[PDB]
From a paper:
Upon cognate ligand binding, [name] oligomerizes and recruits [name] via [name]-[name] interactions. Eventually, the [name] signalling pathway triggers an inflammatory response through NF-κB, MAPK activation and autophagy as well as the production of anti-bacterial peptides, which protect gut epithelial cells from both residual flora and pathogen invasion. Our biophysical, structural and functional data show that [name], via its [name], can form helical filaments, plausibly nucleated from one end by activated [name]. Furthermore, we show that [name] polymerization is essential for NF-ĸB activation by [name], presumably by favouring recruitment of downstream effectors such as the [name] ubiquitin ligase XIAP17.
Residue numbers in the entry:
A (entry chain D), B (entry chain A), C (entry chain E), D (entry chain H), E (entry chain B), F (entry chain I), ...: 433 to 518
Write the structure that this text describes.
């Protein structure tokens, strides 16, 4: 389940066609800052040639990683003036 | 039987060679928005290397899942200007 | 089958090595003008590094999308002084 | 969908071959004025060697960013005496 | 048996490591020109990640499809200055 | 194949290191005179920083565009006292 | 793990939007001075068209190369008056 | 077992996240120099989209190929100033 | 096997880090002069962003194309004062 | 490796910010005197708008070209009263 994952599964159809590739990559590179994502799934989500799987290979990784994963991907998506829901 | 499944079995031969892979994936990722499909059959239908089973592994999953499953896969196939039958 | 698709499958070997990448992109970006192609298969056909799949990932998308799709890709290929067959 | 995006997808084929590179850049640099676009997709849209992708890498970024993004790119395209539609 | 298939099974070990992927794809896309191959095995042979099965998934498809299939795959392999045997 | 393209593929190695950048540009700008090349591949061939791709991005564009394209690029290369072969 | 890599993964989100492209290139060309980086990954990190991957294709290369790699990339980032943390 | 394979299975977890993709490819292309690896598993290990399987599809190929295979992959990993163990 | 391919597989590790990108392109464009390479693998080897695959996507194409292919790529590498072995 | 290249990789960080653009160009034009560099990489290194890549696009070309290349670029850098190391 998860408390940080109350919303990213709820608006996954929102966050696939609204989170741009740099707002993807300003956060996904930030996931390697706390050693909080792994250091070899990064070149599996970045190596996707299209962006529609470059965002979703993160978006199922955040479905499987813990709530301590998604609690830091969310304010990196609220600091961008995109849309606001916690 | 089903009321939402009155049509997807009726035009399964239509929907295999007319529903493209992104119109597949704009709806199949939307199935995880309501927690309405599961979170581990998704990487079983997306991991199909060809598209002719990437669409049909959804299309038998919607044959087995309920009418509350297929009632939301249908207007995600009517909003796309493809073909119209309810 | 299709009536607009009477010709693009007929001369697919013609249209792969004769439709240039800008005549590709002057029409493929025009497919997003009527909301007539999707908004996330576009960065799957444009992200192809070579042009020989940058044209064909459209050319099978127009094999799977309807005749209302291919009826607008054809006069965008007849306004260019390339070759004329409807 | 979007209300500010009622028009930029509607006339994307217009705005690719009519919005010049400085009317591109007088607005795209203005997107960094409100911290309203990101500060590392800017050198991804400006680094495109041709102009036909220097305008469109903005034009799909405005397809994915919100209506608060496109509501400020539009009067920066109406103050220029080019063409008028809201 | 087959008369057009007198040679492609005879030099299958030749044609796997000598027919390059574009000479593969200049002919395999040409197989969809006469509606002569199907329109959903194409994205099963192209979706092979390696080329050593991207050529052979055609090369067993031409073992199972008729002599009217292989009679058109052969001069698309003789027009290329590669090797000549009918 | 082509009848006007009997020679430009035949002497492409000649025409890359013998057609200078202004004899490139006196003809490539002349291709926009008949609306005979497109109006957004022009700033893709001119934006090449080196001349060795500024000539060849035309020279593969004339490999893909028709014989009505190459039949007008040839006497713009025979009026210049460079070399004569039709 | 690494002792020189105690910090570059720690402030990777810092070093992506603060290390400029010449402070990138004054150090990345200096990595070829000791034969300490390879001589064919250099034109893979420099060939990135945007700077946001021109810095990060080094920044994951320093995640995978040893602590003898990152111990020389760090004082080339402390001699520049940018920010100081070892 | 093997004598050259005394170490690559011993530090496979080391060599997956420390051997970079060009130090992968400076050696894996060198394996085709002695005709010592095959000429159609090369485009099966290079076609892996991520690097974490682009290195390991070599790293199990060197688990199955002989000690004459691994005795030449090792000094191509000791000439690089990475880490030293025979 | 091949007689012209006695050497290019023998010194592939030489020819990857010694054949520069213009000595690549002065020969690879010359391969389209005799209609001797194809006209749609050219924009697959040139579209490689790095040079280390821009040379090798030719160097495996010459591993798969015939000895009549490699017999003309070799004196285009001996006329350049680089290194001499037939 | 190379014997003439014992030093230019050793002091590449020296030679990037110490070899001025005319001492670049008095030697790089001299490389076309013996037909010793090519005649179409010259307008790829000179067309670099900045000098920091106008010197380095030579400085990796001399990393890939032979020791007969670098043995003549060195005394053209020792005749200038700049710094002396062979």
């Amino acid at each position: 389940p998860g408390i940080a994952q109350q919303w990213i599964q709820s608006k996954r159809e929102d966050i696939v066609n609204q989170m741009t590739e740099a707002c993807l990559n300003q956060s996904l590179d930030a996931l390697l800052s706390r050693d909080l994502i792994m250091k070899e799934d990064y070149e599996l989500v970045s190596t996707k040639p299209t962006r529609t799987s470059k965002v979703r290979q993160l978006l199922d990784t955040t479905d499987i990683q813990g709530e301590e994963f998604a609690k830091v991907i969310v304010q990196k998506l609220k600091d961008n003036k995109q849309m606001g829901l916690q």
